[PDB]
Design a protein around this ligand. Structure first.
Ligand SMILES: Nc1nc2c(ncn2[C@@H]2O[C@H](COP(=O)(O)OP(=O)(O)OP(=O)(O)O)[C@@H](O)[C@H]2O)c(=O)[nH]1
Ligand SMILES: Nc1nc2c(ncn2[C@@H]2O[C@H](COP(=O)(O)OP(=O)(O)OP(=O)(O)O)[C@@H](O)[C@H]2O)c(=O)[nH]1
Ligand SMILES: Nc1nc2c(ncn2[C@@H]2O[C@H](COP(=O)(O)OP(=O)(O)OP(=O)(O)O)[C@@H](O)[C@H]2O)c(=O)[nH]1
Ligand SMILES: Nc1nc2c(ncn2[C@@H]2O[C@H](COP(=O)(O)OP(=O)(O)O)[C@@H](O)[C@H]2O)c(=O)[nH]1
Lengths: 950, 950
């Protein structure tokens, strides 16, 4: 597991692992020494020092830093501009579920949303960069493939967004002749400053993702201490260390300038700050406004305003269009509340207050002590900095002097600090919800309230620093959890309009079992089919986690899926007519396929969620099409089915026998379903016939179908789907149905839905259509792949053709059918699975690009990456014997993978060059893992499915 | 030229063609009959009836409606909420140049900005839709490719919008299970209705872009008249006709429901209101802040506030950050003015007034009569509706009763109507700028000024309706033109910070010549290179339009372009070494190319503006590579050059002779430049030599280069560039320079820059690289195409191969005039040319898609569309002889085009089928247009440039 190190507030360090439910093995956290601020760089150095002192197994710091890669997040500031989550350190702020996203956790926060990108970047990083540094108050997205990470001492990711937004952050400025290096950094530059440099420089806004080598770490830790030894000091990573980097740095440092700096634009990058109260709402609104298409929005709720976000809360007042810019979290809004706009309500316990909240002021309630509450009303624009007597120092939008004067208070009532509003003990700690409401009314729009002033005088006073230092986070998290327990039922009941069935339902089931909640009730038959499948699978998972019987629920979900996929599978009528002469035989034949990338993304229901991308190609094996079908007229008015590979024969005389797909011991389900779809079953026939015998008498003869699958099913080469398509095409030619290859593949999809195989669509398109292809579908039950052919240069040119090797290993899967687990995880919107499948889609697009550009090396590498993705999706795909075979020859390949679901069988290898291919052949021949392993010659098929007549 | 029909205010109809300088053939305008409103549908029927009565020519209404597609715009309301441009009908409102856009006209208005999208949609529409309907008070953008337009009776464009905004417009509601249909429309639905329909329906905001068939037009016009007679009536297209459409319409209508409705979401659509005074500022601010890319923003100037827009105006006071929401147009702001924020100043003549404008109040001055001015002060929030005695009836932010009382006035001074503020004659018409200023001061923040009241009492009074009805728009446009004449000089001087050199400089040159302005002075050498080229070409165009000598200015612009393209002349040095045996000969050969789509988009400087997209392929002619080069060692230490096609020979003995590219009568400039780039000229040689003879003595021998261009020059098949690349590749093999094909093409670009050809990069990549390719570059001087190969199925498969016909027309022509005209238009940011080139890029992408999908019919159709685009870009591309050749066989083709710049030469035809190809051959053989015309057999080249040794 990637190690996370966090610089947290002192109060949170002791409770982080319990409140966030994370183990101490993968998570280490500490704080700045109480009473001493260290800044960004100083806090990072202190975090590194603490983690080293914790796991110092006797090695020095230098050899310890190399031992593993680490992701360090600094969230140990004061959070002046975000008081609502200052005691949580910003990084633990709950983030609403995106109305366009599937598979998110209901209790997601900024940390859990932002961590995967950091882990991906670190796994892509070179091995000499053992330290990633980031701020936890941002949400960063990358919707395009990451570029190579250079081997510099400092690697900073940047993003050009808007000069107005760049005005508030760090900016990397690079000379127009050299965007590769960093010329200098700028901390919050003005619009005029960026304009004056626009003619000669490019600017990338600093998004707070830095990567440091051991040399840069040494220099930062030397700068974070004093002149002698261990004496710590304040040091800013971005304003002191940052401005000293680049070609022409603003700050001078002999050791910092020697560090090479590399600025990387984040591909498809998006940046959303979460450091101020205004940004808390604006960034969430932007993320919501990334998608507007209602066909891609699973949250079917009409909000009065898009900038209204309610999490872990109970709202007893009606919300209207005038209540814009609203953020309610971990709060209870009583029915007698009166609100306007621009509000941030956090931590408020249950109440029936008659509280009027003016526009622009926010209310925060922090649990303090065992039973007390600290009331912090503040302003959406309050910065909490500066001297109290300055007119610019504001509280709840009002200057602090005016706030004091209007309430009949004097500065003699504030004993303590007076030069910094952050350190002014002005927030009262009450011991009752009634006193809390009274003092909040007094501190807001009722300064004449007698009892409020009395309570404020009786109560102890806390500053924002003291609040963050003494907050009882256990009670805060417990209130949030009780609110979320109520919200689970609320969302499940309101499923037709809520985000319930687009959430990660595995996480939801875990939370249901942990909180002691009952399973959601069964959705009525009138509900959405997808929602019904989600509901049944969630109930099954809850029963499994509880220790009850879940098999019927699971099977019911699968049955709802198969019923859902039926489109024109009932009313698609054909009129088969004997289109050949009496002594003619129809021969159809098809090659198999190898999927290069994007496999699994065509599998329902994920393909229904977002559409699939698959790059694959048709291949003949040992110079022959492995799937073959013969169709001929029969003197008797019945259907004869013969199987060469199974060595069997069967006579179908009635409609009932033709549609008996699950007949015990029959290997003829595929041709039976194919003949049914061709119009020899009543449901698919345009003409009504009394019996199969009468239909065949009107037809002119019976039908004799002989089938050959020269490659057994489960080999991963697409045997079953391609055989179904071959039978369909032979019957198409024999019966004059005039189907084209695309319609044959679609009828194959329908056929496999008749047989309840539950697979995707990639195999039949890969085999029936010639050449190498990219296949893409959109979201929805209607899955009809758009086909884009690719150049076959990398597979047919003499310098490449002999580098594609196919090796039958003689090994079959030792593990069980994990496919069921994968499909059920898809039904539960499992976040890990959905993320991996999305990465597989993007990787299929990258494979398509590599093939288009004619890059053989990149093609082989991406094949290897597809193998890695498949191993990550299924642990049983790579048994140890296959891994030993791989290790025998891995040094001579650009990449390799198993075709299809894998688990053994065939190994596809892309040799580096023809000599490497000869070497691979020699090695695997002289070191056969078993007597059955053998090479199989594969050639790209320029024909696909072929059919001819005698 | 698609015909535009406009329903305008009555006063504007009489002067529209003169004020906007448009011909009466392509522009028709009328108004609703004065005294009766007809609504959207009634106004549409009246506009159609008027245009028919004008251009009937003896046809019936149906056969006239069929003749052509028409774009109808309704801009004929009262414009209560936009008084500053009410007499202009909103649609003629000047709109500031987008700071991120290139090629816009300085005098652009809303009409000129909105027309291109409508014309694009209409040209994409099926031929049965002859009528597009739109409102003139909106600005709509589409930044993603438009989808196919189905063939329905009514086609409506929509946009996914927040429900809160959808509450204020028409809404198309489609069942979630059938988004292809329209279920029903809703006119301004409430939030509760959207809640009730959100669970079962999708809603798209109506953006006001409808397309109607002739039957729908007939029904709309029957509904727009009464029942018995021809008397027109009010009829709403969206509330009456719209609510009667769909599957389950809200309103019942026997004839309207039979119309098929198709709802299309606008890809990448953006909607900007232009109906109220505040929206005038807000939508403009949004459009300005729409683009973020530093590479695409040429106007890099930060004003004190982003919401300050100044057009056609002189401002004598300084503008600061507090002057937000400011719109100054066609106005002179004297130095003694005092303004705040939220202002709209229009039509103010030159003055020295001491006028104080309070925040939120706007000033408008409308020329009236021969020399008079009507002063209309109003409020930014004034709606101009309601009875005068209501407190809500507002004027300049003040209730009208209070405004009357504060100036000692009574309702006995207002003769006329009193129930509608729009019809109250309260605005005085004065006869002098002095009286104008006095009465404006009186009507604003100086109600106690007696002289203002006296002038108001003596002067005639106009209502807003009377202003819009009697306004002297000629004087308004003349004042605007004088202001713009001043602004031209102001912008040209301030070129480093203005939008000057990103404007349409052809329009700018025309305006400079018309207004009698001198050309801008020469930019210093320290200015931006692109800006300097723009400056020189603009001076050249102004001199040419004036009748002076412009050739040196043009040549200087071309030289600045060539110098800008000079890149690696220093950091790409070669060391040629004799790499062949003494008796060995190197033979290089290349096929020609046919560009399928995107030609011209690779030509600088447009390729530098936005990058090029070109789909092209290599072809052999009559089974041979038409470009051939032989290189062999020479006993003498000189260079021998022989030309087979020119039948010539030349001896190069010195560096001076080798670099004499423009030698009189020499056809050897290409091989001389190629040998120079290979390292036989000192500037490109890594080793310094005293003379060419010494370099060749160290080399081991001289060089003998024989060239053959088997296809005559000017054929359009890429002969020159591909021959240059062939020489470069032959010399590369002969000298062991180890260049790859990409480097060969880049050296070809450098060679053509040495020879000052001024072309693009498409030809060399099309010829050197095998197969069919999409080539793409980004913006910037560095033009290095990314190459993506396409499947060659549509060109090599037997059912397609014989449909590609190449016919030498027997016409030759130096296509350098077409090149010069188009390149000079590119230098001037000619709006027509830039728009057409953008469409050519998009069309290249569509061609790439069609080839990927294997669609032969779509491929041929897109070839035809490429021919149409080329004809539209240059009128000289299709001479009448080529057009006559085309007309002989056009009925047997899916498409056709001339390769390259055209002007004659070869005709590429995509026959519908092999029989059609036989027919085309027969027709063109039996009817040869000239003794030289002949068919040439073309075959796709799977080799590209090849080189071998004897
Ligand atoms: N360990 C530690 N980290 C800090 C300290 N100050 C700031 N940081 C971190 O450095 C990053 C950048 O600083 P800021 O965004 O200004 O931190 P902040 O909490 O917003 O500070 P203020 O709002 O000014 O109170 C933040 O993510 C903080 O987590 C500090 O004193 N100690
Ligand atoms: N943590 C978290 N809680 C949420 C989120 N969305 C909603 N909630 C909580 O769940 C409760 C129920 O949500 P819904 O079923 O959508 O109800 P609502 O739309 O918020 O309001 P009503 O239906 O009118 O009661 C809300 O009151 C919120 O407190 C979310 O994205 N994240
Ligand atoms: N031909 C015609 N066009 C109209 C009519 N009414 C409105 N329009 C046009 O349709 C467009 C949309 O209507 P509105 O924006 O509400 O028209 P308007 O002139 O702004 O009306 P007010 O601002 O309320 O005075 C406007 O640009 C008008 O020019 C009409 O009765 N006949
Ligand atoms: N029509 C039109 N006029 C403009 C535009 N931008 C500027 N102008 C006018 O041109 C004059 C020159 O403006 P500019 O060179 O940018 O100077 P600046 O605006 O003071 O910085 C201004 O006084 C404006 O009145 C525009 O986009 N359209």
């Amino acid at each position: 597991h990637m190690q996370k190190l966090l610089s947290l507030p002192s109060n949170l360090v002791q409770s982080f692992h319990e409140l966030e439910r994370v183990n101490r093995t993968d998570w280490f956290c500490t704080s700045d020494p109480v009473g001493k601020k260290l800044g960004s760089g100083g806090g990072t150095s202190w975090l590194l020092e603490e983690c080293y002192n914790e796991y110092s197994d006797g090695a020095t710091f230098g050899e310890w830093l190399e031992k593993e890669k680490r992701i360090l997040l600094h969230a140990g500031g004061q959070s002046r501009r975000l008081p609502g989550y200052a005691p949580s350190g910003k990084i633990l702020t709950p983030v609403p579920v995106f109305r366009w996203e599937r598979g998110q956790h209901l209790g997601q926060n900024l940390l859990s949303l932002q961590l995967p990108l950091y882990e991906k970047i670190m796994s892509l990083a070179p091995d000499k960069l053992h330290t990633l540094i980031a701020s936890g108050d941002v949400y960063i997205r990358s919707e395009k493939p990451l570029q190579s990470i250079p081997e510099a001492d400092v690697v900073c990711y940047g993003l050009w967004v808007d000069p107005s937004l760049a005005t508030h952050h760090g900016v990397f400025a690079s000379d127009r002749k050299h965007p590769e290096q960093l010329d200098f950094m700028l901390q919050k530059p003005s619009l005029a400053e960026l304009e004056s440099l626009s003619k000669t420089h490019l600017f990338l806004m600093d998004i707070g993702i830095w990567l440091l080598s051991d040399r840069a770490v040494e220099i930062l830790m030397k700068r974070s201490h004093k002149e002698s030894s261990e004496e710590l000091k304040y040091y800013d990573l971005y304003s002191d260390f940052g401005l000293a980097l680049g070609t022409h740095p603003r700050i001078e440092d002999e050791e910092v300038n020697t560090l090479s700096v590399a600025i990387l634009p984040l591909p498809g990058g998006e940046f959303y700050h979460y450091g101020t109260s205004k940004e808390l709402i604006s960034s969430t609104l932007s993320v919501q406004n990334k998608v507007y298409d209602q066909r891609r929005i699973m949250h079917r709720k009409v909000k009065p305003n898009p900038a209204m976000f309610v999490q872990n809360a109970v709202v007893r007042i009606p919300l209207c269009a005038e209540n814009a810019d609203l953020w309610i979290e971990n709060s209870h809004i009583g029915p007698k509340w009166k609100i306007a706009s621009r509000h941030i309500i956090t931590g408020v316990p249950e109440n029936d207050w008659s509280l009027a909240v003016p526009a622009g002021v926010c209310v925060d309630v922090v649990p303090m002590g065992d039973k007390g509450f600290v009331a912090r009303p503040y302003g959406l624009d309050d910065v909490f900095k500066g001297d109290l007597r300055d007119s610019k120092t504001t509280l709840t939008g009002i200057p602090f002097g005016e706030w004091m004067s209007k309430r009949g208070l004097s500065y003699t009532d504030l004993k303590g600090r007076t030069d910094d509003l952050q350190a002014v003990s002005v927030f009262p700690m009450v011991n009752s919800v009634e006193e809390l409401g009274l003092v909040l009314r007094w501190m807001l729009s009722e300064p004449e309230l007698e009892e409020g002033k009395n309570i404020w005088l009786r109560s102890e006073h806390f500053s924002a620093d003291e609040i963050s230092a003494g907050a009882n986070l256990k009670r805060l998290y417990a209130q949030r959890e009780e609110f979320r327990k109520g919200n689970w039922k609320a969302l499940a009941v309101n499923h037709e309009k809520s985000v319930f069935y687009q959430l990660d339902l595995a996480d939801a089931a875990e939370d249901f079992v942990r909180l002691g909640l009952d399973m959601p009730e069964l959705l009525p038959e009138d509900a959405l089919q997808m929602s019904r499948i989600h509901n049944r699978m969630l109930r099954a998972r809850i029963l499994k986690l509880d220790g009850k019987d879940y098999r019927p629920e699971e099977q019911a979900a699968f049955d709802l899926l198969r019923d859902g996929l039926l489109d024109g599978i009932s009313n698609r009528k054909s009129t088969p007519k004997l289109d050949v002469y009496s002594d003619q035989i129809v021969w159809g034949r098809s090659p198999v396929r190898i999927d290069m990338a994007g496999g699994w993304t065509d599998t329902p229901p994920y393909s229904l969620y977002s559409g699939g991308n698959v790059v694959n190609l048709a291949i003949e094996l040992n110079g022959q099409p492995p799937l073959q079908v013969y169709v001929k007229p029969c003197k008797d008015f019945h259907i004869v089915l013969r199987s060469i590979d199974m060595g069997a024969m069967e006579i179908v005389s009635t409609f009932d026998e033709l549609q008996d797909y699950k007949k015990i011991g029959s290997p003829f389900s595929i041709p039976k379903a194919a003949l049914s779809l061709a119009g020899f079953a009543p449901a698919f026939s345009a003409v009504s016939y009394a019996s199969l015998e009468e239909q065949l008498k009107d037809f002119g003869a019976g039908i004799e179908v002989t089938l050959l699958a020269a490659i057994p099913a489960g080999s991963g080469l697409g045997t079953s789907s391609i055989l179904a398509s071959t039978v369909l095409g032979a019957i198409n030619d024999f019966c004059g149905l005039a189907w084209d290859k695309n319609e044959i593949c679609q009828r194959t999809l329908v056929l496999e839905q008749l047989l309840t195989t539950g697979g995707g669509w990639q195999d039949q398109y890969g085999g029936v259509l010639q050449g190498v292809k990219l296949l893409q579908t959109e979201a929805g039950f209607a899955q009809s792949p758009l086909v884009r052919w690719l150049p076959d240069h990398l597979f047919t040119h003499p310098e490449y053709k002999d580098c594609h090797l196919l090796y039958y290993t003689g090994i079959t899967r030792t593990a069980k059918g994990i496919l069921a687990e994968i499909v059920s995880s898809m039904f539960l919107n499992s976040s890990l699975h959905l993320n991996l499948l999305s990465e597989m889609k993007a990787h299929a697009l990258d494979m398509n690009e590599a093939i288009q550009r004619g890059s053989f090396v990149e093609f082989g590498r991406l094949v290897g990456k597809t193998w890695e993705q498949n191993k990550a999706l299924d642990s049983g795909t790579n048994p140890p014997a296959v891994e030993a075979i791989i290790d025998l020859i891995k040094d001579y390949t650009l990449g390799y993978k198993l075709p299809g679901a894998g688990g053994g069988g065939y190994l596809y290898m892309v040799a580096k060059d023809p000599q490497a291919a000869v070497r691979i052949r020699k090695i695997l021949t002289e070191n056969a893992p078993n007597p059955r392993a053998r090479f199989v010659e594969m050639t790209l098929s320029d024909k696909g499915f072929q059919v001819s007549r005698s």
